[PDB]
Ligand binder design. Structure first.
Ligand SMILES: [N-]=[N+]=NCCCn1c(Br)nc2c(N)ncnc21
Ligand SMILES: [N-]=[N+]=NCCCn1c(Br)nc2c(N)ncnc21
Ligand SMILES: [N-]=[N+]=NCCCn1c(Br)nc2c(N)ncnc21
Ligand SMILES: [N-]=[N+]=NCCCn1c(Br)nc2c(N)ncnc21
Lengths: 264, 264, 264, 264
């Protein structure tokens, strides 16, 4: 079938990519970076994230594979020495697939700008444009808290091992369809109050951020970060779309967690 | 149908119980504390927990209701002033039910003791009998970490607002079938390593605690706490059984979280 | 003696300032905002911080007083109703003074820029200009750690109740001549390692931040925040200068902590 | 002068002790475990702590030395290979000394028990005898908070790298004469409130714990832990006594922190 390969750009990843392309030539495999059914990432998790966002409009027809040329990654979790064996089973077809949930982000503005929607594989964060960050947090049309601090982070299940982890969030198995909200240096006293604990939301729950004074926020989605003007609402919810991985052997998530944070 | 009412034992709760019993006499309602279909708790969450454990062998034929005579509780979430209105719709039958997941705990010993299983509504904790607490944490037959510290806590979703919250755990909506493991003052250095972050496990995942040197542990299940001798394994997993609540009006979990921790 | 009064700018603070000026006219008190010996701040802690930085070159000849027109502040800790009584003892002379330690910040550049030194009453923070923040932390010419994360915060003792507190730092009594370093969402795994815990340094200890790749950092000193280019080193140490307060009654720091965070 | 050596009891430490005793015989050194001026500990920090408490009534006439036969310790910070060189300079006399602050603990009872005072090198902790732990925290005769949770920990400066560190406390240089109080899984909601942050107290500040309902507490001092009955007050303050170390080369505290927690 149609496939393509993205590379980190260094000497190790480019030559591994050329080797896999040459190996794919020995099989009925067509290179196509416009409508691929198999997208292979070579480098790190950042290389995988770019590959995800390059084809986020055909997620339902693509099975991703990540190869790490450096340290082990949560998405690029196959060593370069397994590249040749990867080519065989990838061209043989007939492989099982694993799907992870994604985060949907919706940004609404005033008159002049159309509602913008984004799709995140790791997390989406909100900070202020320069002054103090103050927003009202509304959960399913119910006012929950007035947050004051550095910012907030909403994470996918597979994204919990990234920025979410550094903020005290919990690591959840990617088979749980949920999203997790964490705080960034919240100010708490007798007058200002936040929950403090991370919050885990199931499907169909809508978490809304609404400005109090400043309407400009620095919003990030994975590696992309843009300053948004005249914002009326930020809307978070578990996406109905999922990312599909090609599965060729058992690499449990908790083993991947152990290898990355305990030892390997 | 058959019903019964437990009371905290103070003057406020006993008289409210007698009032509801008198009100139930005006309807086709039989008092039975042996095979009740409706169990009403009056007092606090601790009173509700005792009512849960008193009838944990007929959870599939009982719809629980909690009434708080003091502050708002996560299980006893109905004010005493709504008692009369509660009697009407409770005796009218025809009400919807909400189910929360439970935690299954299995304790295995050597020769002489039979495997003991417990059912928790909030959480189960493990500490040492006196010396240092050291256990190996095994996730789905895979060694994950060697934990050294004060202890560990495995929480239900609805139990996340209790002891789990005090240990840095995340608050998760009770509709998510999961369990959450948190650490208690773990020692970390160059030689001893733990994950630190809380872990959220889905259904069918088995988390096992195995001793290293001492085989005596102080194991708690909700309010009950017993010293266990000659322990070979502690086994945690989401229970196949659920607790059923009688639903008479919308009291969202996140609103219950807001009223208890933000303001009311 | 010579005195001056700064105001928050709102209607409540301006009229209180005019009242105190009129009261000072009944005594031998000269208004001078060039060489004052008494600087009175009316508003909040932010108003006090501006007054501190306006006269940070004559700290050894000025006794500060803070008046809070809103909620209680750690520096503006006198209610407006005590203004008249404040005027009497302030003009009577003869009052005791309390001194708090300050933080000295030194920023070194390459060729073209002179070494810049700053004096902070609360804290100084360092973040990246846009990309990832990575610095080597050197303590008394000894390499301690390579920090990767959002940033770092070095706090004065009296500044520990501000941004330091939101980052997990400890609250220390302002009579202890020290400074406290805290982390901002540090990334930790098997390859990247930080201490995690806050660090408290005594006098004459020098903590140095040295770049790894990017040499541009967003450095803050209290409310001021400037992007610094071509930075070679950031140097932190307890300042030899102290801020002097005029003391007219016992308001213990721990009581001030209790009133602000527990209840009042 | 008079000296003595304590051993961990294993084969490595006993033989190293006999070797040092034989080496001391080549000099004017008298073995005396009743009135020694030099106390050498061989093993780990736990071996050093026992040596400290064995001679805590002659701390002003003893210079301690710690030798670690296993991993590096904060008190036993000299490798076994430096034992022979240690004997020479120890018998040569003429060495500088370093002093660390200690924590004084005072426990008061009702009629029948005399006030008991303890001296801690690391920390003192308080937990409940079985039920819930609730105490009022009084700072310099001022009520600060009502603590509810698992317990509290008051640490010396050098003790901050031990149990204090596991509870989120800050690491402070042992030259700062202070003590640090940390919380153990405190319950916080709209009705119950604690400061949360660790607190650092200078000399002459008195922190008092007073019971609310239960008067039985499990009080620990370093490795010793005793259940105290009918307790009226627990009193913490920086001790006027200090522990003296013999200094033979520069091993900075922050380097000792780096070697133990970052890498070595
Ligand atoms: N070291 N490093 N890189 C910074 C982190 C990069 N990263 C990305 Br992108 N995704 C993940 C992830 N799911 N879990 C952990 N880390 C991640
Ligand atoms: N104050 N107080 N009581 C101590 C806590 C009692 N508690 C029980 Br039991 N269950 C819960 C729960 N699910 N969430 C919060 N708190 C709970
Ligand atoms: N609410 N509010 N204002 C944000 C915090 C303002 N602030 C300043 Br400035 N100094 C301090 C301080 N020493 N302790 C606490 N807070 C402070
Ligand atoms: N691994 N291990 N042992 C458990 C900790 C033993 N320990 C003792 Br005792 N004192 C200290 C100390 N000052 N800093 C760190 N650790 C200590």
């Amino acid at each position: 079938m149609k496939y393509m390969i993205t590379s980190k750009g260094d000497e190790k990843s480019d030559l591994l990519r050329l080797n896999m392309i040459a190996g794919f030539g020995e099989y009925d495999m067509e290179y196509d970076d416009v409508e691929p059914e198999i997208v292979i990432s070579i480098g790190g998790d950042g290389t995988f994230l770019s590959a995800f966002h390059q084809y986020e409009e055909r997620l339902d027809e693509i099975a991703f594979i990540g190869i790490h040329t450096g340290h082990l990654g949560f998405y690029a979790d196959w060593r370069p020495a397994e590249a040749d064996k990867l080519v065989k089973l990838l061209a043989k077809g007939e492989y099982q697939k694993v799907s992870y949930p994604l985060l949907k982000t919706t940004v609404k503005y005033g008159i002049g700008k159309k509602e913008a929607t984004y799709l995140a594989l790791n997390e989406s964060t909100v900070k202020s444009s320069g002054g103090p960050f103050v927003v009202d947090v509304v959960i399913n049309d119910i006012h929950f808290e007035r947050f004051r601090g550095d910012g907030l982070c909403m994470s996918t299940p597979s994204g919990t091992t990234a920025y979410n982890k550094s903020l005290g969030g919990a690591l959840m198995h990617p088979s749980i369809e949920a999203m997790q909200l964490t705080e960034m240096a919240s100010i708490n006293n007798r007058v200002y109050r936040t929950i403090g604990s991370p919050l885990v939301f199931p499907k169909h729950h809508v978490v809304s951020l609404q400005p109090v004074n400043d309407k400009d926020f620095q919003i990030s989605v994975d590696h992309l970060s843009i300053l948004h003007r005249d914002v009326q609402e930020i809307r978070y919810e578990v996406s109905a779309k999922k990312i599909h991985f090609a599965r060729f052997r058992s690499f449990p998530f908790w083993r991947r967690v152990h290898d990355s944070f305990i030892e390997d």
